Tab-separated table of C-alpha atoms (C1' of nucleotides) in Angstrom:
chain	number	residue	atom	x	y	z
A	1	UNK	CA	22.440	31.397	-15.153
A	2	UNK	CA	21.528	28.343	-17.271
A	3	UNK	CA	18.650	29.004	-19.691
A	4	UNK	CA	15.611	26.746	-20.065
A	5	UNK	CA	17.217	24.581	-22.751
A	6	UNK	CA	20.342	24.095	-20.656
A	7	UNK	CA	18.383	23.307	-17.510
A	8	UNK	CA	16.151	20.813	-19.324
A	9	UNK	CA	19.252	19.125	-20.683
A	10	UNK	CA	20.363	18.538	-17.078
A	11	UNK	CA	16.918	17.333	-16.098
A	12	UNK	CA	17.065	14.523	-18.677
A	13	UNK	CA	20.578	13.586	-17.529
A	14	UNK	CA	19.386	13.449	-13.924
A	15	UNK	CA	16.206	11.454	-14.589
A	16	UNK	CA	18.207	8.947	-16.639
A	17	UNK	CA	20.039	7.396	-13.704
A	18	UNK	CA	17.860	8.433	-10.799
A	19	UNK	CA	14.590	7.645	-9.102
A	20	UNK	CA	13.025	11.070	-8.773
A	21	UNK	CA	9.697	10.807	-6.958
A	22	UNK	CA	8.713	14.467	-6.718
A	23	UNK	CA	9.326	17.793	-8.396
A	24	UNK	CA	10.989	19.150	-5.265
A	25	UNK	CA	13.578	16.307	-5.336
A	26	UNK	CA	14.362	17.231	-8.925
A	27	UNK	CA	14.875	20.803	-7.651
A	28	UNK	CA	17.175	19.662	-4.828
A	29	UNK	CA	19.148	17.661	-7.412
A	30	UNK	CA	19.365	20.610	-9.833
A	31	UNK	CA	20.366	22.884	-6.936
A	32	UNK	CA	23.357	20.647	-6.238
A	33	UNK	CA	24.463	21.445	-9.795
A	34	UNK	CA	24.127	25.168	-9.242
A	35	UNK	CA	20.756	25.471	-10.939
A	36	UNK	CA	18.008	27.074	-8.856
A	37	UNK	CA	14.375	26.985	-10.022
A	38	UNK	CA	10.970	26.503	-8.439
A	39	UNK	CA	8.531	23.600	-8.675
A	40	UNK	CA	6.300	25.688	-10.988
A	41	UNK	CA	9.048	25.874	-13.603
A	42	UNK	CA	9.814	22.169	-13.134
A	43	UNK	CA	6.152	21.272	-13.521
A	44	UNK	CA	6.500	23.017	-16.890
A	45	UNK	CA	9.900	21.614	-17.880
A	46	UNK	CA	8.868	18.006	-17.381
A	47	UNK	CA	5.879	18.731	-19.600
A	48	UNK	CA	7.498	20.309	-22.645
A	49	UNK	CA	9.931	17.421	-22.211
A	50	UNK	CA	7.342	14.657	-22.456
A	51	UNK	CA	8.490	13.175	-19.148
A	52	UNK	CA	5.865	11.211	-17.206
A	53	UNK	CA	5.407	9.855	-13.703
A	54	UNK	CA	5.076	6.069	-13.671
A	55	UNK	CA	3.359	4.196	-10.825
A	56	UNK	CA	5.362	1.949	-8.529
A	57	UNK	CA	5.053	-1.828	-8.772
A	58	UNK	CA	3.674	-1.768	-5.218
A	59	UNK	CA	0.830	0.623	-6.026
A	60	UNK	CA	2.204	3.822	-4.522
A	61	UNK	CA	3.858	6.850	-6.077
A	62	UNK	CA	6.297	6.170	-8.886
A	63	UNK	CA	9.172	7.906	-10.612
A	64	UNK	CA	9.705	10.440	-13.379
A	65	UNK	CA	11.061	9.166	-16.673
A	66	UNK	CA	11.766	10.912	-19.958
A	67	UNK	CA	10.661	9.358	-23.288
A	68	UNK	CA	14.375	9.052	-24.110
A	69	UNK	CA	15.005	8.231	-27.761
A	70	UNK	CA	18.225	6.349	-27.039
A	71	UNK	CA	21.563	7.095	-25.360
A	72	UNK	CA	23.496	8.113	-23.234
A	73	UNK	CA	23.266	4.407	-22.407
A	74	UNK	CA	26.282	3.347	-20.334
A	75	UNK	CA	27.543	3.110	-16.759
A	76	UNK	CA	30.081	1.360	-14.532
A	77	UNK	CA	28.145	-1.889	-14.037
A	78	UNK	CA	27.261	-1.862	-17.719
A	79	UNK	CA	23.607	-1.115	-17.077
A	80	UNK	CA	23.225	-3.868	-14.511
A	81	UNK	CA	22.535	-1.432	-11.659
A	82	UNK	CA	20.051	0.851	-13.413
A	83	UNK	CA	18.205	-2.280	-14.515
A	84	UNK	CA	18.208	-3.673	-10.966
A	85	UNK	CA	16.859	-0.363	-9.664
A	86	UNK	CA	14.065	-0.265	-12.227
A	87	UNK	CA	13.220	-3.928	-11.568
A	88	UNK	CA	12.686	-3.206	-7.884
A	89	UNK	CA	10.567	-0.211	-8.808
A	90	UNK	CA	8.528	-1.567	-11.750
A	91	UNK	CA	8.468	-5.386	-11.702
A	92	UNK	CA	5.030	-6.504	-10.531
A	93	UNK	CA	5.514	-10.228	-11.219
A	94	UNK	CA	7.137	-12.878	-13.372
A	95	UNK	CA	6.084	-16.034	-15.191
A	96	UNK	CA	7.347	-18.136	-18.104
A	97	UNK	CA	6.578	-20.516	-20.939
A	98	UNK	CA	9.107	-22.305	-23.094
A	99	UNK	CA	11.952	-19.922	-23.907
A	100	UNK	CA	10.015	-16.885	-22.726
A	101	UNK	CA	10.072	-14.965	-19.465
A	102	UNK	CA	6.902	-12.897	-19.022
A	103	UNK	CA	7.188	-9.795	-16.822
A	104	UNK	CA	4.373	-7.493	-15.673
A	105	UNK	CA	4.785	-3.829	-14.759
A	106	UNK	CA	2.333	-1.035	-14.116
A	107	UNK	CA	0.656	0.318	-17.270
A	108	UNK	CA	2.946	2.485	-19.395
A	109	UNK	CA	6.027	1.260	-17.507
A	110	UNK	CA	6.892	-1.747	-19.687
A	111	UNK	CA	8.942	0.055	-22.346
A	112	UNK	CA	11.193	1.715	-19.769
A	113	UNK	CA	11.968	-1.475	-17.890
A	114	UNK	CA	12.502	-3.242	-21.239
A	115	UNK	CA	14.974	-0.576	-22.455
A	116	UNK	CA	16.828	-0.879	-19.170
A	117	UNK	CA	17.024	-4.646	-19.562
A	118	UNK	CA	18.297	-4.281	-23.132
A	119	UNK	CA	20.844	-1.714	-22.008
A	120	UNK	CA	22.293	-4.111	-19.407
A	121	UNK	CA	22.947	-6.569	-22.235
A	122	UNK	CA	22.450	-9.677	-20.112
A	123	UNK	CA	24.187	-12.675	-21.689
A	124	UNK	CA	21.220	-15.038	-21.409
A	125	UNK	CA	18.776	-12.561	-22.946
A	126	UNK	CA	18.411	-12.553	-26.733
A	127	UNK	CA	16.153	-9.509	-26.659
A	128	UNK	CA	12.921	-8.047	-25.317
A	129	UNK	CA	9.665	-6.673	-26.649
A	130	UNK	CA	7.538	-4.462	-24.440
A	131	UNK	CA	3.833	-3.841	-24.664
A	132	UNK	CA	1.955	-1.634	-22.223
A	133	UNK	CA	2.151	-3.573	-18.956
A	134	UNK	CA	3.939	-6.699	-20.196
A	135	UNK	CA	7.412	-7.538	-21.478
A	136	UNK	CA	8.403	-10.690	-23.317
A	137	UNK	CA	12.024	-11.510	-22.662
A	138	UNK	CA	13.624	-14.078	-24.937
A	139	UNK	CA	16.116	-16.468	-23.363
A	140	UNK	CA	19.223	-17.544	-25.267
A	141	UNK	CA	19.603	-21.336	-25.648
A	142	UNK	CA	20.069	-23.338	-23.483
A	143	UNK	CA	18.598	-20.946	-20.900
A	144	UNK	CA	14.875	-21.456	-20.296
A	145	UNK	CA	12.255	-18.777	-19.820
A	146	UNK	CA	11.738	-20.285	-16.374
A	147	UNK	CA	15.368	-19.690	-15.445
A	148	UNK	CA	15.298	-16.082	-16.644
A	149	UNK	CA	12.027	-15.431	-14.841
A	150	UNK	CA	13.608	-16.776	-11.646
A	151	UNK	CA	16.550	-14.456	-12.136
A	152	UNK	CA	14.254	-11.414	-12.510
A	153	UNK	CA	12.090	-12.634	-9.638
A	154	UNK	CA	15.168	-12.445	-7.391
A	155	UNK	CA	15.629	-8.790	-8.248
A	156	UNK	CA	11.988	-7.864	-7.731
B	1	UNK	CA	32.594	-20.023	-16.008
B	2	UNK	CA	34.193	-16.820	-14.654
B	3	UNK	CA	37.034	-17.489	-12.194
B	4	UNK	CA	37.351	-15.820	-8.790
B	5	UNK	CA	39.358	-12.874	-10.124
B	6	UNK	CA	36.836	-12.258	-12.890
B	7	UNK	CA	33.866	-12.535	-10.552
B	8	UNK	CA	35.441	-10.182	-8.005
B	9	UNK	CA	36.058	-7.692	-10.785
B	10	UNK	CA	32.298	-7.677	-11.442
B	11	UNK	CA	31.545	-7.378	-7.751
B	12	UNK	CA	33.507	-4.112	-7.519
B	13	UNK	CA	31.773	-2.791	-10.647
B	14	UNK	CA	28.385	-3.643	-9.155
B	15	UNK	CA	29.052	-2.191	-5.694
B	16	UNK	CA	30.326	1.023	-7.287
B	17	UNK	CA	26.946	2.240	-8.500
B	18	UNK	CA	24.583	0.222	-6.351
B	19	UNK	CA	23.189	0.003	-2.859
B	20	UNK	CA	23.711	-3.648	-2.027
B	21	UNK	CA	22.308	-4.406	1.422
B	22	UNK	CA	22.889	-8.153	1.631
B	23	UNK	CA	25.076	-10.875	0.193
B	24	UNK	CA	22.075	-12.521	-1.449
B	25	UNK	CA	21.284	-9.289	-3.379
B	26	UNK	CA	24.857	-9.272	-4.638
B	27	UNK	CA	24.228	-12.869	-5.782
B	28	UNK	CA	20.975	-11.934	-7.545
B	29	UNK	CA	22.868	-9.098	-9.264
B	30	UNK	CA	25.757	-11.377	-10.298
B	31	UNK	CA	23.240	-13.978	-11.509
B	32	UNK	CA	21.765	-11.413	-13.893
B	33	UNK	CA	25.241	-11.222	-15.436
B	34	UNK	CA	25.449	-14.972	-15.846
B	35	UNK	CA	27.579	-15.544	-12.768
B	36	UNK	CA	26.196	-18.038	-10.254
B	37	UNK	CA	27.767	-18.395	-6.794
B	38	UNK	CA	26.559	-18.909	-3.243
B	39	UNK	CA	26.544	-16.537	-0.277
B	40	UNK	CA	29.469	-18.474	1.263
B	41	UNK	CA	31.709	-17.583	-1.672
B	42	UNK	CA	30.457	-13.983	-1.600
B	43	UNK	CA	31.121	-13.733	2.124
B	44	UNK	CA	34.689	-14.633	1.135
B	45	UNK	CA	34.964	-12.436	-1.964
B	46	UNK	CA	33.925	-9.275	-0.158
B	47	UNK	CA	36.596	-10.069	2.415
B	48	UNK	CA	39.659	-10.637	0.251
B	49	UNK	CA	38.386	-7.497	-1.476
B	50	UNK	CA	38.425	-5.284	1.607
B	51	UNK	CA	34.780	-4.342	1.078
B	52	UNK	CA	32.844	-3.362	4.211
B	53	UNK	CA	29.233	-2.885	5.236
B	54	UNK	CA	28.527	0.677	6.358
B	55	UNK	CA	25.615	1.551	8.662
B	56	UNK	CA	22.705	3.601	7.377
B	57	UNK	CA	22.265	7.217	8.451
B	58	UNK	CA	18.986	6.151	10.079
B	59	UNK	CA	20.580	3.490	12.279
B	60	UNK	CA	19.549	0.365	10.395
B	61	UNK	CA	21.430	-1.900	8.016
B	62	UNK	CA	23.733	-0.195	5.548
B	63	UNK	CA	25.384	-0.954	2.237
B	64	UNK	CA	28.492	-2.702	0.953
B	65	UNK	CA	31.291	-0.530	-0.376
B	66	UNK	CA	34.732	-1.381	-1.705
B	67	UNK	CA	37.820	0.601	-0.581
B	68	UNK	CA	38.100	1.770	-4.203
B	69	UNK	CA	41.423	3.444	-4.950
B	70	UNK	CA	39.963	5.706	-7.630
B	71	UNK	CA	38.052	5.268	-10.898
B	72	UNK	CA	35.933	4.210	-12.816
B	73	UNK	CA	34.455	7.548	-11.743
B	74	UNK	CA	31.860	8.698	-14.284
B	75	UNK	CA	28.175	8.412	-15.163
B	76	UNK	CA	25.359	10.101	-17.080
B	77	UNK	CA	24.504	12.748	-14.470
B	78	UNK	CA	28.206	13.329	-13.924
B	79	UNK	CA	28.178	11.787	-10.467
B	80	UNK	CA	25.205	13.816	-9.301
B	81	UNK	CA	22.973	10.749	-8.903
B	82	UNK	CA	25.423	8.458	-7.110
B	83	UNK	CA	26.135	11.344	-4.745
B	84	UNK	CA	22.414	11.935	-4.158
B	85	UNK	CA	21.940	8.231	-3.432
B	86	UNK	CA	24.804	8.148	-0.945
B	87	UNK	CA	23.574	11.363	0.704
B	88	UNK	CA	20.188	9.794	1.381
B	89	UNK	CA	21.919	6.716	2.737
B	90	UNK	CA	24.782	8.250	4.762
B	91	UNK	CA	24.021	11.892	5.628
B	92	UNK	CA	23.097	12.068	9.310
B	93	UNK	CA	23.004	15.876	9.564
B	94	UNK	CA	24.398	19.178	8.361
B	95	UNK	CA	25.704	22.388	9.897
B	96	UNK	CA	27.987	25.256	8.865
B	97	UNK	CA	30.395	27.989	9.877
B	98	UNK	CA	31.839	30.637	7.609
B	99	UNK	CA	32.728	29.060	4.269
B	100	UNK	CA	32.393	25.533	5.615
B	101	UNK	CA	29.572	23.016	5.429
B	102	UNK	CA	29.927	20.339	8.120
B	103	UNK	CA	28.334	16.956	7.373
B	104	UNK	CA	28.001	13.974	9.726
B	105	UNK	CA	27.753	10.345	8.632
B	106	UNK	CA	27.960	7.066	10.486
B	107	UNK	CA	31.496	6.115	11.571
B	108	UNK	CA	33.690	4.916	8.706
B	109	UNK	CA	31.236	6.276	6.121
B	110	UNK	CA	32.683	9.783	5.728
B	111	UNK	CA	35.358	9.001	3.129
B	112	UNK	CA	32.882	7.293	0.804
B	113	UNK	CA	30.352	10.103	0.877
B	114	UNK	CA	33.213	12.604	0.448
B	115	UNK	CA	34.594	10.769	-2.622
B	116	UNK	CA	31.105	10.719	-4.089
B	117	UNK	CA	30.751	14.452	-3.521
B	118	UNK	CA	34.139	15.093	-5.136
B	119	UNK	CA	33.211	12.876	-8.064
B	120	UNK	CA	30.044	14.903	-8.752
B	121	UNK	CA	32.253	17.979	-9.109
B	122	UNK	CA	29.659	20.420	-7.793
B	123	UNK	CA	30.412	23.955	-8.987
B	124	UNK	CA	30.063	25.602	-5.577
B	125	UNK	CA	32.332	23.087	-3.846
B	126	UNK	CA	36.069	23.807	-3.809
B	127	UNK	CA	36.853	20.445	-2.244
B	128	UNK	CA	36.225	18.149	0.708
B	129	UNK	CA	38.188	16.496	3.480
B	130	UNK	CA	36.719	13.509	5.271
B	131	UNK	CA	37.516	12.260	8.731
B	132	UNK	CA	35.790	9.275	10.301
B	133	UNK	CA	32.217	10.484	10.791
B	134	UNK	CA	32.611	14.081	9.603
B	135	UNK	CA	33.268	15.813	6.290
B	136	UNK	CA	34.340	19.410	5.833
B	137	UNK	CA	33.096	20.743	2.533
B	138	UNK	CA	34.627	23.987	1.324
B	139	UNK	CA	32.332	26.420	-0.468
B	140	UNK	CA	33.595	28.439	-3.428
B	141	UNK	CA	33.203	32.229	-3.033
B	142	UNK	CA	30.657	33.782	-2.884
B	143	UNK	CA	28.777	30.666	-1.737
B	144	UNK	CA	28.556	30.324	2.046
B	145	UNK	CA	28.925	27.159	4.075
B	146	UNK	CA	25.348	27.784	5.185
B	147	UNK	CA	24.103	27.703	1.602
B	148	UNK	CA	25.962	24.482	0.811
B	149	UNK	CA	24.736	22.859	4.011
B	150	UNK	CA	21.173	23.776	3.021
B	151	UNK	CA	21.723	22.210	-0.373
B	152	UNK	CA	22.948	18.937	1.192
B	153	UNK	CA	20.189	19.094	3.797
B	154	UNK	CA	17.652	19.022	0.948
B	155	UNK	CA	19.121	15.784	-0.342
B	156	UNK	CA	19.246	14.098	3.053
C	1	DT	C1'	38.253	-22.919	-4.666
C	2	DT	C1'	33.554	-23.682	-3.848
C	3	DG	C1'	29.058	-25.410	-2.025
C	4	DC	C1'	26.615	-27.202	2.025
C	5	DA	C1'	25.157	-26.903	6.640
C	6	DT	C1'	24.999	-24.570	10.508
C	7	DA	C1'	26.828	-21.960	14.003
C	8	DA	C1'	28.056	-17.040	15.261
C	9	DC	C1'	25.955	-12.654	15.070
C	10	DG	C1'	23.958	-8.283	14.294
C	11	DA	C1'	19.168	-6.161	13.754
C	12	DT	C1'	14.338	-5.422	14.778
C	13	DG	C1'	10.014	-5.554	17.866
C	14	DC	C1'	7.946	-5.636	22.224
C	15	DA	C1'	7.642	-5.129	27.237
C	16	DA	C1'	9.131	-3.165	31.559
D	1	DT	C1'	15.750	3.992	27.438
D	2	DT	C1'	17.048	-0.709	28.408
D	3	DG	C1'	16.736	-5.741	28.154
D	4	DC	C1'	14.750	-9.934	26.111
D	5	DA	C1'	13.551	-13.087	22.815
D	6	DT	C1'	13.063	-13.678	17.734
D	7	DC	C1'	14.241	-13.256	12.801
D	8	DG	C1'	17.369	-12.413	9.103
D	9	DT	C1'	22.384	-11.982	7.595
D	10	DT	C1'	27.001	-13.447	7.609
D	11	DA	C1'	30.975	-16.527	8.792
D	12	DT	C1'	33.094	-21.074	8.606
D	13	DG	C1'	34.357	-26.323	9.665
D	14	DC	C1'	34.244	-30.063	6.609
D	15	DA	C1'	34.181	-32.572	2.473
D	16	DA	C1'	35.017	-32.854	-2.383
E	1	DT	C1'	10.140	32.859	-19.105
E	2	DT	C1'	9.785	32.530	-14.299
E	3	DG	C1'	8.243	32.955	-9.404
E	4	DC	C1'	4.264	33.360	-6.308
E	5	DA	C1'	0.007	31.827	-4.564
E	6	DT	C1'	-3.299	28.745	-4.576
E	7	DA	C1'	-6.439	25.853	-6.614
E	8	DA	C1'	-6.887	21.101	-8.740
E	9	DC	C1'	-5.609	16.537	-7.631
E	10	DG	C1'	-3.778	12.130	-6.671
E	11	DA	C1'	-2.254	9.303	-2.496
E	12	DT	C1'	-2.510	7.466	2.138
E	13	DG	C1'	-5.004	6.126	6.636
E	14	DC	C1'	-9.007	4.897	9.034
E	15	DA	C1'	-13.756	3.299	9.643
E	16	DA	C1'	-17.779	0.787	8.142
F	1	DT	C1'	-13.238	-3.960	-0.156
F	2	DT	C1'	-15.233	0.591	-0.351
F	3	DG	C1'	-15.898	5.412	0.990
F	4	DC	C1'	-14.453	9.487	3.636
F	5	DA	C1'	-11.689	12.979	5.191
F	6	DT	C1'	-6.791	14.522	5.364
F	7	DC	C1'	-2.053	15.377	3.715
F	8	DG	C1'	1.318	15.938	0.180
F	9	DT	C1'	2.243	16.790	-4.921
F	10	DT	C1'	1.377	19.065	-9.109
F	11	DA	C1'	-0.853	22.521	-12.233
F	12	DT	C1'	-1.795	27.322	-13.356
F	13	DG	C1'	-3.976	32.373	-13.393
F	14	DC	C1'	-1.693	36.582	-12.752
F	15	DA	C1'	1.870	39.846	-12.510
F	16	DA	C1'	6.442	41.297	-13.672
DNA sequence: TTGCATAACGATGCAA
DNA sequence: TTGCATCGTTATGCAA
DNA sequence: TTGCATAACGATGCAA
DNA sequence: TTGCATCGTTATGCAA
């Protein structure tokens, strides 16, 4: 049987490319991998892991994310899909000014969406900077912030 | 500008780890990658690509999948997440007998869910065989078909 | 080959 | 549960 | 460290 | 829009 450290390692791997909305779902997911634990232990794992539960862009219940310090950062679509999933879950609205796209997310969710956007390495994005509930996305010339905002708006 | 072949290559990469429910979503996703095309062209790409639109386990609109002939078959969770996503989208019900878990999906959806399950390489699964709307999953001793079916039932 | 315009069409909601 | 009318999604004739 | 039992708690629906 | 009561999710005292 996998020890705590080993289980927690799987938790992080699962939360990285999933939209886990409850502790029981995390359990169902771990069970598929042969790891059986209760919600009580999960409630504790997520904690000594720093993982938090963000709110959804629509106001309801959000997802669990882990304060990842970097990689694994790669998938089939090159990050395009994970970004699209997080956009639908965390993008509250979009706006622009000059060469800047301004995106709003629930509080505390900005960094995660921003990492996801960086990971997808979009060709018209020079880079992003996330605050608490806002992300500034810099468009690469000749792309305008308005164009980028429209692109994100279509994935909201 | 990416030619047809290049665009189609991206389509397959995007449909592989996503749940695209319309042709416009595919467009929004391609746009994020710097590729701009209309629905008309997409309606044609998906066709000369063999991609089809499965029905959802709940009866409503499904997702687009490509008759993939194999890999790329790998992600962070090791396939656990893509499988979980497809389970929620295609698993209609579960049952068991002896060392067999029996899963039902909409017609034509069985092979896709089965590939996904194989890709996740679950430790208690010896292998799967998919028909049209049914999948036989073989449990590895001492796991019973009942146990496996319960595990899939929790991800439905 | 692709976009435009629009017809062909499958899905969803309501009423009987 | 079935059928009807309505809305969104997908397919395609035509022009460039 | 973990499961059990249950309390503490945040979310959703309805009514004013 | 706000508040109230109800349901699901998460946190934890206690025992092993």
